[PDB]
mmCIF file of C-alpha atoms in Angstrom:
data_model
loop_
_atom_site.group_PDB
_atom_site.id
_atom_site.type_symbol
_atom_site.label_atom_id
_atom_site.label_comp_id
_atom_site.label_asym_id
_atom_site.label_seq_id
_atom_site.Cartn_x
_atom_site.Cartn_y
_atom_site.Cartn_z
ATOM 1 C CA UNK P 446 167.033 23.718 -39.631
ATOM 2 C CA UNK P 447 170.120 22.640 -37.715
ATOM 3 C CA UNK P 448 172.217 19.590 -38.579
ATOM 4 C CA UNK P 449 171.760 16.097 -37.311
ATOM 5 C CA UNK P 450 175.104 14.571 -36.275
ATOM 6 C CA UNK P 451 177.169 13.563 -39.321
ATOM 7 C CA UNK P 452 175.065 15.353 -41.941
ATOM 8 C CA UNK P 453 176.556 16.576 -45.244
ATOM 9 C CA UNK P 454 174.070 17.869 -47.835
ATOM 10 C CA UNK P 455 175.586 20.246 -50.396
ATOM 11 C CA UNK P 456 173.024 22.838 -51.490
ATOM 12 C CA UNK P 457 173.197 26.270 -53.121
ATOM 13 C CA UNK P 458 169.517 27.228 -52.771
ATOM 14 C CA UNK P 459 169.455 30.793 -51.465
ATOM 15 C CA UNK P 460 167.175 30.895 -48.434
ATOM 16 C CA UNK P 461 164.461 33.526 -48.010
ATOM 17 C CA UNK P 462 164.659 35.316 -44.654
ATOM 18 C CA UNK P 463 161.847 37.750 -45.504
ATOM 19 C CA UNK P 464 158.085 37.479 -45.799
ATOM 20 C CA UNK P 465 158.200 36.440 -49.482
ATOM 21 C CA UNK P 466 160.538 33.970 -51.233
ATOM 22 C CA UNK P 467 162.727 35.281 -54.046
ATOM 23 C CA UNK P 468 162.680 31.924 -55.916
ATOM 24 C CA UNK P 469 166.441 31.603 -56.334
ATOM 25 C CA UNK P 470 167.126 35.285 -57.069
ATOM 26 C CA UNK P 471 169.645 37.044 -54.832
ATOM 27 C CA UNK P 472 167.619 40.043 -53.671
ATOM 28 C CA UNK P 473 166.172 41.573 -50.534
ATOM 29 C CA UNK P 474 166.079 39.225 -47.520
ATOM 30 C CA UNK P 475 167.427 36.363 -49.684
ATOM 31 C CA UNK P 476 171.075 35.885 -48.730
ATOM 32 C CA UNK P 477 173.611 33.574 -50.348
ATOM 33 C CA UNK P 478 174.083 30.542 -48.052
ATOM 34 C CA UNK P 479 177.827 30.108 -48.662
ATOM 35 C CA UNK P 480 180.091 32.588 -46.861
ATOM 36 C CA UNK P 481 183.792 32.800 -47.691
ATOM 37 C CA UNK P 482 186.485 33.932 -45.263
ATOM 38 C CA UNK P 483 189.451 36.199 -45.918
ATOM 39 C CA UNK P 484 192.459 34.198 -44.751
ATOM 40 C CA UNK P 485 195.542 36.404 -44.317
ATOM 41 C CA UNK P 486 199.042 35.824 -42.928
ATOM 42 C CA UNK P 487 198.348 39.015 -40.939
ATOM 43 C CA UNK P 488 194.984 37.753 -39.640
ATOM 44 C CA UNK P 489 194.370 37.582 -35.920
ATOM 45 C CA UNK P 490 194.869 34.232 -34.214
ATOM 46 C CA UNK P 491 191.108 33.881 -33.792
ATOM 47 C CA UNK P 492 190.776 34.266 -37.574
ATOM 48 C CA UNK P 493 193.864 32.393 -38.800
ATOM 49 C CA UNK P 494 193.249 28.993 -40.429
ATOM 50 C CA UNK C 347 156.462 49.062 -20.455
ATOM 51 C CA UNK C 348 155.191 48.095 -23.914
ATOM 52 C CA UNK C 349 155.275 44.968 -26.081
ATOM 53 C CA UNK C 350 156.968 45.516 -29.449
ATOM 54 C CA UNK C 351 155.879 43.598 -32.553
ATOM 55 C CA UNK C 352 159.157 43.169 -34.433
ATOM 56 C CA UNK C 353 157.593 41.655 -37.572
ATOM 57 C CA UNK C 354 156.083 44.847 -39.022
ATOM 58 C CA UNK C 355 159.371 46.621 -39.746
ATOM 59 C CA UNK C 356 161.232 43.394 -40.569
ATOM 60 C CA UNK C 357 158.618 42.459 -43.192
ATOM 61 C CA UNK C 358 157.996 45.992 -44.488
ATOM 62 C CA UNK C 359 161.197 45.613 -46.566
ATOM 63 C CA UNK C 360 161.428 49.404 -46.880
ATOM 64 C CA UNK C 361 164.738 49.529 -44.972
ATOM 65 C CA UNK C 362 167.931 49.990 -46.979
ATOM 66 C CA UNK C 363 170.045 48.960 -43.962
ATOM 67 C CA UNK C 364 169.154 46.261 -41.423
ATOM 68 C CA UNK C 365 172.181 45.160 -39.356
ATOM 69 C CA UNK C 366 171.500 43.460 -36.020
ATOM 70 C CA UNK C 367 174.251 42.440 -33.575
ATOM 71 C CA UNK C 368 173.945 40.352 -30.430
ATOM 72 C CA UNK C 369 170.484 39.193 -31.549
ATOM 73 C CA UNK C 370 169.428 37.586 -34.823
ATOM 74 C CA UNK C 371 166.801 39.309 -37.002
ATOM 75 C CA UNK C 372 164.042 36.705 -36.575
ATOM 76 C CA UNK C 373 164.405 36.078 -32.819
ATOM 77 C CA UNK C 374 163.515 39.634 -31.783
ATOM 78 C CA UNK C 375 159.876 38.552 -31.431
ATOM 79 C CA UNK C 376 160.813 35.702 -29.070
ATOM 80 C CA UNK C 377 163.037 37.650 -26.671
ATOM 81 C CA UNK C 378 162.013 39.629 -23.583
ATOM 82 C CA UNK C 379 164.037 42.776 -22.902
ATOM 83 C CA UNK C 380 164.296 45.151 -19.961
ATOM 84 C CA UNK C 381 164.609 48.383 -21.969
ATOM 85 C CA UNK C 382 165.325 49.508 -25.519
ATOM 86 C CA UNK C 383 166.764 52.833 -26.697
ATOM 87 C CA UNK C 384 165.607 54.217 -30.073
ATOM 88 C CA UNK C 385 167.870 56.735 -31.880
ATOM 89 C CA UNK C 386 166.172 58.405 -34.924
ATOM 90 C CA UNK C 387 168.086 60.674 -37.396
ATOM 91 C CA UNK C 388 169.020 61.144 -41.115
ATOM 92 C CA UNK C 389 172.538 60.254 -42.430
ATOM 93 C CA UNK C 390 173.935 60.450 -45.987
ATOM 94 C CA UNK C 391 173.988 57.240 -48.024
ATOM 95 C CA UNK C 392 177.577 55.986 -48.121
ATOM 96 C CA UNK C 393 177.959 57.216 -44.531
ATOM 97 C CA UNK C 394 175.462 54.577 -43.333
ATOM 98 C CA UNK C 395 178.270 52.018 -43.702
#
Protein backbone atom coordinates (compact mmCIF):
# COMPACT_ATOMS: atom_id res chain seq x y z
CA UNK A 1 0.00 0.00 0.00
CA UNK A 2 1.05 3.61 -0.43
CA UNK A 3 2.89 5.64 2.21
CA UNK A 4 1.37 7.73 4.92
CA UNK A 5 3.12 11.11 5.19
CA UNK A 6 6.52 10.77 6.89
CA UNK A 7 6.74 6.97 6.76
CA UNK A 8 10.10 5.14 6.69
CA UNK A 9 9.96 1.34 7.08
CA UNK A 10 12.99 -0.48 5.67
CA UNK A 11 11.98 -3.89 4.31
CA UNK A 12 13.51 -6.37 1.86
CA UNK A 13 10.56 -8.78 1.61
CA UNK A 14 10.07 -9.50 -2.08
CA UNK A 15 6.42 -8.91 -2.92
CA UNK A 16 4.34 -11.41 -4.89
CA UNK A 17 2.57 -9.84 -7.87
CA UNK A 18 1.20 -13.17 -9.14
CA UNK A 19 -1.54 -15.52 -8.01
CA UNK A 20 0.76 -17.45 -5.63
CA UNK A 21 3.40 -16.13 -3.20
CA UNK A 22 6.99 -17.25 -3.69
CA UNK A 23 7.78 -17.06 0.06
CA UNK A 24 10.90 -14.92 -0.25
CA UNK A 25 12.28 -16.60 -3.38
CA UNK A 26 13.00 -14.35 -6.36
CA UNK A 27 11.03 -16.11 -9.09
CA UNK A 28 8.10 -15.57 -11.42
CA UNK A 29 5.88 -12.59 -10.51
CA UNK A 30 7.98 -11.97 -7.36
CA UNK A 31 10.14 -8.92 -8.06
CA UNK A 32 12.86 -7.45 -5.86
CA UNK A 33 11.45 -4.32 -4.17
CA UNK A 34 14.67 -2.27 -4.30
CA UNK A 35 15.55 -0.78 -7.69
CA UNK A 36 18.94 0.82 -8.30
CA UNK A 37 19.60 3.57 -10.83
CA UNK A 38 22.54 3.94 -13.20
CA UNK A 39 23.91 7.41 -12.49
CA UNK A 40 26.24 8.61 -15.27
CA UNK A 41 28.00 11.90 -16.02
CA UNK A 42 26.55 11.42 -19.52
CA UNK A 43 23.01 10.80 -18.23
CA UNK A 44 20.18 12.98 -19.44
CA UNK A 45 19.13 15.87 -17.23
CA UNK A 46 15.93 14.03 -16.32
CA UNK A 47 18.10 11.14 -15.08
CA UNK A 48 21.05 13.01 -13.55
CA UNK A 49 21.24 13.04 -9.73
CA UNK B 1 -17.51 -4.67 -28.17
CA UNK B 2 -16.41 -7.33 -25.66
CA UNK B 3 -15.32 -7.36 -22.02
CA UNK B 4 -11.83 -8.81 -21.50
CA UNK B 5 -10.92 -10.70 -18.33
CA UNK B 6 -7.26 -9.78 -17.86
CA UNK B 7 -6.65 -12.16 -14.93
CA UNK B 8 -6.56 -15.43 -16.90
CA UNK B 9 -3.38 -14.70 -18.86
CA UNK B 10 -1.78 -12.71 -16.03
CA UNK B 11 -2.24 -15.63 -13.61
CA UNK B 12 -1.52 -18.41 -16.12
CA UNK B 13 2.21 -17.70 -15.61
CA UNK B 14 2.99 -19.42 -18.92
CA UNK B 15 4.35 -16.20 -20.46
CA UNK B 16 8.12 -15.80 -20.72
CA UNK B 17 7.73 -12.06 -21.44
CA UNK B 18 5.16 -9.74 -19.86
CA UNK B 19 6.07 -6.05 -20.32
CA UNK B 20 3.27 -3.50 -20.00
CA UNK B 21 3.73 0.24 -20.62
CA UNK B 22 1.30 3.06 -19.95
CA UNK B 23 -0.79 0.73 -17.76
CA UNK B 24 0.29 -1.39 -14.80
CA UNK B 25 -0.17 -5.19 -14.94
CA UNK B 26 -2.84 -5.44 -12.22
CA UNK B 27 -5.00 -2.44 -13.24
CA UNK B 28 -5.95 -3.84 -16.65
CA UNK B 29 -9.09 -5.34 -15.08
CA UNK B 30 -10.16 -1.96 -13.67
CA UNK B 31 -9.75 0.14 -16.82
CA UNK B 32 -12.27 0.71 -19.62
CA UNK B 33 -10.81 1.02 -23.11
CA UNK B 34 -12.21 2.10 -26.46
CA UNK B 35 -10.36 -0.46 -28.61
CA UNK B 36 -7.45 -2.88 -28.34
CA UNK B 37 -5.25 -4.24 -31.14
CA UNK B 38 -3.87 -7.79 -30.79
CA UNK B 39 -0.72 -8.72 -32.78
CA UNK B 40 0.07 -12.51 -32.71
CA UNK B 41 3.34 -13.98 -34.14
CA UNK B 42 6.45 -16.10 -33.26
CA UNK B 43 9.89 -14.46 -32.65
CA UNK B 44 13.23 -16.07 -31.69
CA UNK B 45 14.21 -15.99 -28.02
CA UNK B 46 16.90 -13.34 -27.59
CA UNK B 47 15.06 -11.25 -30.20
CA UNK B 48 12.10 -10.81 -27.81
CA UNK B 49 14.22 -8.25 -25.95
